[PDB]
Write a protein that binds this DNA or RNA. Structure first.
Length: 73
DNA sequence: GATCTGGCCTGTCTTACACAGTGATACAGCCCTTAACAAAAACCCG
């Protein structure tokens, strides 16, 4: 952890200054879409969409009507 | 005894009587990227 901190502090300062100046310090959504598109580049739409969900926040499970629909159909 | 008539027996017909669901294969979309060139509102700027 400390290892990768050292390894990447240069990119850290780079991206933080550039994103803070560009969009007004909203590094959250900037880096969000950054990693989204970067991971989609290698055709990981599965992981990209589940990460879109995890950040969006929604429906980890199902509600009883849907489970009933499944075991009936 | 000859004859007229009904009963039985087959025989044709007309409606029904359970095939969608299995795995495997084949396409058909559909997005990512290179790089640039052009194009709807969104909006201050004049």
């Amino acid at each position: 952890r400390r290892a990768q901190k050292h390894r990447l502090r240069e990119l850290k300062i780079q991206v933080k200054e550039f994103a803070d100046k560009e969009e007004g310090g909203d590094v959250k959504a900037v880096c969000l879409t950054l990693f989204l598109l970067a991971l989609r580049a290698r055709n990981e739409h599965r992981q990209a969409d589940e990460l879109e969900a995890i950040m969006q926040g929604r429906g980890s499970g199902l509600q009883p009507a849907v489970c009933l629909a499944i075991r009936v159909n």
